[PDB]
């Protein structure tokens, strides 16, 4: 008798249920969805293959050596699927686990997915929702950010890249959507800034709130960082599918041709 089977079920249920039911309820309280159902809505049903499900972070400092600070998946869901029959690679970030802060495993999974996509020659779609770099990791988060930036720069002009912010993205994670071809946001729930309002108050001594500092309207009306805005997530995902129906799979293929009437 081996307990290596019930362990698989426990790990799978922990990955599917995220970081707790209370955090999921808080997420739904603000009218914001979860990563797995986002991926299910975006991709065709029955065609999503998940990879790197059992990956865990290797931090051993500031008390995360205990079990209470250990979560499989590490606040990111990656895999491949099909949209209207055409292959695509997609990654989504989970705000439930450590606020979506990026760590070694998170960046490693993204880098592996991007490497597979550039090798095969398929587009990349990213749903960005992260609180920034993991503060306790140290230089590891900086290394992950730099590697992701390098892979974003390398793949530019070879395969299309799309970013879709659904939550508060701050810190150094804001430079990855800026290096992609197109950027979209969601009204009243998505934010994009480098420094928080508290730092603004501390430094320049001028009163400002988060919404006017990094809201969807600010970046979509007179800032030129985002391309379009959507009121909620389902309509945003439907429009993202419609837009992806336009783009070719790679720079080596001609513009798509569809039946006309």
């Amino acid at each position: 008798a081996t307990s290596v089977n019930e362990r698989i079920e426990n790990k799978r249920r922990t990955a599917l249920l995220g970081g707790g039911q209370r955090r999921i309820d808080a997420q739904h309280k603000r009218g914001k969805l979860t990563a797995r159902e986002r991926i299910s809505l975006l991709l065709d049903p029955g065609s999503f293959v998940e990879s790197d499900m059992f990956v865990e972070h290797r931090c051993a400092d500031f008390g995360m050596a205990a079990d209470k600070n250990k979560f499989p998946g590490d606040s990111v869901v990656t895999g491949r699927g099909r949209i209207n029959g055409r292959l695509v690679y997609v990654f989504s970030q989970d705000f439930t686990v450590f606020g979506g802060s990026l760590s070694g495993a998170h960046a490693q999974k993204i880098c592996k997915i991007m490497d597979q996509a550039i090798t095969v020659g398929a587009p990349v779609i990213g749903l960005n929702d992260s609180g920034g770099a993991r503060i306790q990791e140290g230089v590891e988060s900086l290394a992950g950010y730099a590697d992701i930036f390098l892979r974003n720069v390398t793949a530019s002009g070879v395969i299309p890249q799309i970013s879709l912010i659904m939550g508060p993205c701050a810190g150094g994670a804001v430079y990855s959507p800026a290096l992609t071809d197109f950027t979209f946001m969601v009204k009243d729930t998505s934010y994009l800034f480098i420094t928080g309002p508290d730092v603004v108050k501390s430094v320049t001594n001028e009163d400002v709130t988060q919404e006017e500092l990094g809201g969807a309207k600010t970046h979509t009306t007179m800032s030129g960082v985002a391309h379009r805005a959507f009121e909620n997530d389902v309509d945003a995902l439907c429009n993202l599918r419609d837009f992806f129906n336009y783009l070719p799979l790679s720079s080596q293929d001609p513009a798509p041709v569809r039946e006309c009437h």
């Binding site: 306790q136 730099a146 930036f149 070879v158 430079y175 290096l179 800032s223 030129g224 720079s251």
Partner: protein, 247 residues
């Protein structure tokens, strides 16, 4: 001009306290041959330094920060000013030499309303796309994503060095202490241990993110020998008509 000339004057140019400012143009004059430096745009966006110089007779590109102006923080103008020069040096096979002293990006409402993200991405892309050999030296400061934007090791950099007074950290010691040990509500000692173990270049050195920690007086010799070695660099990239600059 000998390539192994020592520069003992740099052993104390960096103040021991972290609140004082200094001139990077002095260091640039110290390192380059015959102390000749053709500065580009000297009166525009004075928080960054770009220009043309020679090392062992070979033309090189110089990029660095100016802590005397705006504490060396990056802003909208300096981003494009450095990015265009880096791209031009890339286009014609000119090596790049980098001096890093940055605490982050300039904050406020004007920079965010004006689109600081696009120009930061401009500079980051200009450094990441580089194929010519690059040597980077860290003098005092490297905080946040500015360290990655400033030609870190993970952007296909060649060699990186750090002075003994340098240090690499995610963000400020005070902020890190107040955001990590929130429940403990005791920052009297925690700050002391945090600055004792992380306010030094050792966490980056032990991970291999920087090659060695060198004395400031051997910077010219190290850069000269590295540039001589790295003259035959060739790197291949996937085919494409052109890439997408974030302009």
């Amino acid at each position: 001009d000998p390539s192994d000339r020592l520069v003992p004057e740099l052993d104390t140019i960096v103040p021991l306290e972290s609140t004082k400012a200094y001139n990077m143009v002095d260091i640039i004059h110290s390192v380059v041959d015959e102390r000749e430096f053709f500065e580009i745009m000297p009166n525009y966006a004075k928080n960054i330094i770009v220009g043309f110089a020679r090392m062992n007779g070979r033309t090189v590109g110089i990029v660095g920060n100016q802590p005397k102006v705006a504490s060396g923080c990056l802003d909208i103008n300096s981003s494009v000013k450095g990015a265009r020069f880096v791209r031009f040096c890339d286009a014609f096979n000119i090596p790049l030499i980098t001096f890093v002293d940055v605490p982050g990006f300039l904050p406020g409402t004007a920079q965010e309303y004006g689109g600081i993200i696009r120009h930061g991405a401009k500079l980051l892309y200009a450094f990441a796309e580089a194929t010519v050999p690059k040597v980077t030296v860290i003098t005092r400061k490297a905080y946040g994503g500015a360290y990655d934007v400033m030609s870190s090791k993970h952007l296909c950099g060649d060699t990186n060095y750090a002075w003994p007074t340098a240090e690499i950290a995610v963000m400020g010691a005070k902020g890190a202490v107040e955001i990590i040990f929130k429940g403990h509500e005791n920052v009297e000692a925690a700050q002391a241990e945090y600055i004792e173990k992380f306010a030094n270049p050792f966490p980056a050195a032990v991970r291999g993110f920087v090659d060695d920690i060198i004395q400031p007086s051997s910077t010219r010799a190290r850069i000269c020998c590295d540039l001589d070695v790295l003259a035959s660099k060739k790197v291949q990239r996937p085919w494409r008509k052109h890439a997408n600059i974030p302009l």
